[PDB]
């Protein structure tokens with residue numbers, strides 16, 4: 001059905017329309033906390049804020065603000081905390097969140113520098129010998145190892161609560177080939193990546209919500225979560241036909257503004273889901289075909 005609609009929409013080149021329509025019906029909620037003068041420097045983009053009703057509150061008494069939303073997908077029983085790329089001054093806040101929320105995985109969908117501009121702080125350690133200590137949130141983050149693949153890298157980090165000397169293994173999934181405001185090379189590579197994250201247990205309910213982010217935490221991050229939820233629902237009832245992707249994107253837009261920034265990302269979202277269904281519906285071999293087509297070997 002989504003395939004029909006796909007060809008339908010492609011056949012008459014109406015993605016820009018379908019996309020603007022979703023924008024017209026997207027929820028709109030107040031962002032008072034994020035817009036408070038004291039939090040001006042805690043936001044990377046003036047036009048990208050968390051709604052008040054679904055923002056992740058830091059557990060400190062000083063200022064509990066951080067540009068992050070908890071997208072809670074009720075029907076699919078999956079939660080994601082989408083956030084902006086940490087600013088030089090908010091890296092402590094970022095790891096505080098991860099710790100307090102009990103996250104197991106962190107999904108980075110952008111490179112530190114894109115189009116010749118600094119899109120995100122270097123918030124994680126790059127060399128084992130050089131760990132990082134966030135003095136304001138009293139946390140330590142050490143690089144334990146990293147598995148570099150052609151288009152993405154998986155890092156194992158150790159987060160420690162200097163106040164209690166408690167430690168946690170944090171998996172860092174970094175997609176290094178997704179153009180800014182762009183779309184993955186092929187659904188195959190994107191799906192290979194999604195399933196890698198899935199296989200890590202990072203998306204399991206026995207863990208806090210996975211923290212997903214790009215520069216603003218709405219475009220590429222939205223695409224990622226949309227495909228994951230759609231594939232998940234489709235899986236829950238083994239009924240591809242009952243999955244209304246636009247209805248699902250709107251559900252998500254209730255928790256964070258502007259998820260999916262371009263009509264092409266929306267088109268890619270359809271592709272990834274349609275392609276992913278192959279695996280969800282019983283063809284377990286397609287996962288290897290993706291791993292091949294993705295060319296993850298250096």
Ligand SMILES: COC(=O)c1c(O)cccc1OC/C=C/c1ccc(F)c(-c2cc(C(=O)O)no2)c1
Nearest residue numbers: 023045047180181214215216218219220257258261
């Ligand atoms: C397309 O716009 C919307 O859907 C929308 C809406 O309908 C209502 C309210 C706000 C809206 O978005 C504000 C985003 C601003 C905005 C400004 C600068 C940015 F670098 C980005 C950005 C970058 C990325 C990435 O890294 O891929 N994703 O988003 C988004």
